[PDB]
Ligand binder design. Structure first.
Ligand SMILES: OC[C@@H]1O[C@@H](O[C@@H]2[C@@H](O)[C@H](O[C@@H]3CO[C@@H](O)[C@H](O)[C@H]3O)OC[C@H]2O)[C@H](O)[C@H]1O
Ligand SMILES: OC[C@@H]1O[C@@H](O[C@@H]2[C@@H](O)[C@H](O[C@@H]3CO[C@@H](O)[C@H](O)[C@H]3O)OC[C@H]2O)[C@H](O)[C@H]1O
Ligand SMILES: O[C@@H]1[C@@H](O)[C@H](O[C@@H]2CO[C@@H](O)[C@H](O)[C@H]2O)OC[C@H]1O
Ligand SMILES: O[C@@H]1[C@@H](O)[C@H](O[C@@H]2CO[C@@H](O)[C@H](O)[C@H]2O)OC[C@H]1O
Ligand SMILES: O[C@@H]1[C@@H](O)[C@H](O[C@@H]2CO[C@@H](O)[C@H](O)[C@H]2O)OC[C@H]1O
Ligand SMILES: O[C@@H]1[C@@H](O)[C@H](O[C@@H]2CO[C@@H](O)[C@H](O)[C@H]2O)OC[C@H]1O
Ligand code: XYS
Ligand code: XYP
Ligand code: XYP
Lengths: 436, 436
């Protein structure tokens, strides 16, 4: 369809997934969102080295199958995460070196992939093998010490274990094209493809924050890797602050690249995130869709037709032909907004911020005083509350994040002075808005 | 001692208090702040009816005394809260009505005031006796049902129990003069003064939010009651969003009325607030001062003798005479800012929001990716993180809310291109900024 992320992505042959935590599958609020929005699943921890092989030789797939089963039963493919990694290695592997580790690594791969043979769409065969030292070289780990050729061996092994699975190299901070880490990974994959090493994909974790910000050149990075002859996938996406524009930009970068299989966000609600302090996901802890959720859905669905009032613009009601107006250009907090003949004026110029606010006068925010039908919509000092955040639906409707209700011209009024309130979305013309 | 709220309030002959929860007194972070900043204390719950008279005729002051003991031990006066109220009534009282409830009410006042006789500066004798239906009438409670005279009886009883205390009538939604509830209370107080009913004060809770926002006519409300011959006090102040301007405005309103005894904010840190979801106080959960704190302090100190950069403006370092500049007018997230020759360019126009952000381009925020010295100050999409909020100190320095560090011109550099960083605050000219 086009009302959920997974369905929207499928329209272009792609998937939109998440990271599932087994301990939450018992939470109905959690599973209600997950089963509905995503068609791809990655076990957040259940399929890692320490979890699938607690003791060398003895494999445990209980927790993993739990996630795997839920996924397939609910219509989702699975990304295996992960086979060869320097982190989250069980204690016994952390003490292995030389040719014995190399052997342990190979066994582990055969074991996990054997168990899930033919059931995994994508396997993160090797994860984070490059350093952040700025040199573009291999990270210094027990695995790297077994020989520079360990990555290649891991991939050749994997291909044997399960030729049906797409084999990916996964890593973070390899999104910005100008980074040495990015280039080192690029050179490696190019080489692998030239020498014939069995690698089918590169996973871009895409953990963006002010420390390592998203950069428009991310698309260039994806296109370059795609040109090598391998698929690309956004594997663990989360953006600090969950900016609508950035989430939409990453989404469009994937859509702009034919080889971009899909996008996986690292968690369901912000409260489930490994970095909840950055409220980096698409759903609030209370389960409500954030502004970024609708920006992603719209991008996946192809979006609108023409460019929006990028910073500054009027919001005109479809049924009335009138604009959202702040009475007498008042700046008083608590002043309820109204409908009025459109004209150039600041009290009619609204800016949609990446945070999902509809700002007027620069520091005033469209604000909902409550969450039920009839709630008054007014201006109030901006502070970031969810009752000041809105989702801009592609159907012309504007929905409050906190209330999940639509901007509504009271009683379907069209005359000047008609007040604005929150009300159950009805697709009515007094709940649809366009551009002047 | 204009360095703390209490000390600064004292220079205008006023106090600045908070609400203390005894269960948090064992928290050093909480007490360090509470002891330093306030010189007035109100027990958030420990002196209420249910807490002081658990069973009819059986008084318990353990919780109350823990708060009181801490208050006087740290040089603070105490506001007793509260003696007669329709809410938080112990079960045995909720079951009463008529003459039996009337006497219980009187018995409670006598027992509680007797224990604290001569130790309480102000007592909220009656709390929330008026309705919100918008009629300005009395609230329909078991207390009101005993007779319309119950409030008068409560005050006469209180004066007799401890004539050394100021007797206050406390309520909410009585700050906006145009509201019926406000006028209803005004008429009652006026009635009491005329007939000689003992009443020395009116407490305006001041719980401001988008449901009932602050209105500048609050100053007239305070003036109106003051004219009746009673002192006035802002008793449970908290503002949804903690707007710097709203906090400064409420502070100035009180300072504009000679009879306004002082201001009490309902809580220390946002996490201690009964409405933490509204982040309505002056300190963060980590104990750090918020943008609103500095605005209240500056307000208490009389503020700047000249209007700040209202609606955009340049920020010029004193030790360099150069302006805060975004390299090549770039709008790319992650771009570290610099010092550069001041000129009418948008990449040099910064706007300080009520949330404490230093915005550029409209939706880009001065950002710090880290909390330690040497951390680069850059621009990033605005999302409300504390690493995107700043305090404008009277000494001319700009401090990061999350880091507690000052914007610093690297190596005291002065030439163009000099980068900005976060560093331990100094009185240096490379950390001083003039509002031009
Ligand atoms: O709270 C009581 C009254 O209810 C609200 O006012 C209502 C208003 O909410 C209602 O809105 C209509 C509802 O149907 C929708 O299809 C339509 O789009 C929407 O405009 O219209 C009647 C009006 O009286 C206020 O809370 C108060 O008036
Ligand atoms: O969440 C449990 C505890 O609840 C907070 O305490 C609140 C207290 O702050 C509240 O005070 C009322 C607020 O409304 C005013 O009109 C009234 O005058 C004032 O007394 O009363 C309820 C009580 O539960 C604790 O901080 C939080 O830990
Ligand atoms: O585990 C990984 C983290 O170690 C990694 O940390 C990043 C390092 O570079 C900085 O610029 C980033 O801000 C910081 O997040 O992030 C990815 C995560 O998987
Ligand atoms: O719950 C946490 C997981 O969410 C976390 O996941 C890792 C984050 O960093 C990425 O680089 C890894 O690929 C990803 O598996 O691991 C730690 C766990 O506690
Ligand atoms: O219990 C009391 C609440 O019922 C009261 O609610 C207020 C109603 O009017 C609105 O305008 C206010 O925003 C809202 O807080 O608040 C005080 C509380 O003690
Ligand atoms: O790396 C060095 C910085 O750490 C250094 O920081 C200075 C510390 O003292 C403060 O008084 C200065 O303002 C601050 O710049 O600056 C030089 C840089 O090379
Ligand atoms: O724009 C104005 C609107 O805000 C009010 O009503 C009069 C209009 O002219
Ligand atoms: O110019 C007029 C404007 O001032 C008013 O607010 O709305 C109608 C316009 O024609
Ligand atoms: O950012 C600077 C810009 O403002 C100035 O005009 O030219 C030099 C740039 O570095």
């Amino acid at each position: 369809a086009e009302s959920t992320l997974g369905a929207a992505a499928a329209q272009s042959g792609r998937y939109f997934g998440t990271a599932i935590a087994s301990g939450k599958l018992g939470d109905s609020a959690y599973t209600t969102i997950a089963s509905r929005e995503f068609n791809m699943v990655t076990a957040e921890n259940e399929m890692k080295i320490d979890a699938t092989e607690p003791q060398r030789g003895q494999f445990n797939f209980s927790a993993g199958d739990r996630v795997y089963n839920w996924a397939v039963q609910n219509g989702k493919q699975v990304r295996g995460h992960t086979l060869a990694w320097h982190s989250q290695q069980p204690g016994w592997m952390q003490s292995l070196s030389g040719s014995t580790l190399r052997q342990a690594m190979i066994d582990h791969i055969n074991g996990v992939m054997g168990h899930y043979k033919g059931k995994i769409a994508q396997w993160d065969v090797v994860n984070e093998a490059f350093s952040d030292d700025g040199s573009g070289g291999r990270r210094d780990s027990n695995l790297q010490r077994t020989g520079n050729d360990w990555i290649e061996v891991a991939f050749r092994t994997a291909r044997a274990a399960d030729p049906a699975a797409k084999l990916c190299y996964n890593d973070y901070n390899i999104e910005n094209w100008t980074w040495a880490k990015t280039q080192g990974v690029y050179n490696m994959v190019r080489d692998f493809k030239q020498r014939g090493v069995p690698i089918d994909c590169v996973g871009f974790q895409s953990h963006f924050n002010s420390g390592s910000p998203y950069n428009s050149n991310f698309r260039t990075t994806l296109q370059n890797f795609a040109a090598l002859g391998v698929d690309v996938a956004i594997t663990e996406l989360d953006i600090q602050g969950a900016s609508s524009s950035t989430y939409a930009a990453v989404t469009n970068d994937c859509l702009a690249v034919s080889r971009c299989l899909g996008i996986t966000v690292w968690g369901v609600r912000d409260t489930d995130s490994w970095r909840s302090g950055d409220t980096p996901l698409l759903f609030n802890g209370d389960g409500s869709k954030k502004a970024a959720y609708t920006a992603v859905l719209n991008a996946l669905n192809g979006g609108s037709s023409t460019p929006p009032p990028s910073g500054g613009g009027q919001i005109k009601g479809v049924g009335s032909g009138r604009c959202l107006d702040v009475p007498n250009a008042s700046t008083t907090d608590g002043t309820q907004v109204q409908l009025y003949d459109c004209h150039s004026a600041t009290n009619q110029q609204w800016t949609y911020t990446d945070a999902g606010e509809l700002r007027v006068y620069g520091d005033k925010c469209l604000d909902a005083a409550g969450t039920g039908n009839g709630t008054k919509v007014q201006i109030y000092s901006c502070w970031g509350g969810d009752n000041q955040k809105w989702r801009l639906n592609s159907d012309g409707s504007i929905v409050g994040v906190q209330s999940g209700l639509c901007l509504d011209a009271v009683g379907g009024g069209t005359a000047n002075g008609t007040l604005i309130q929150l009300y159950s979305c009805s697709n009515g013309s007094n709940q649809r808005w366009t551009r002047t």
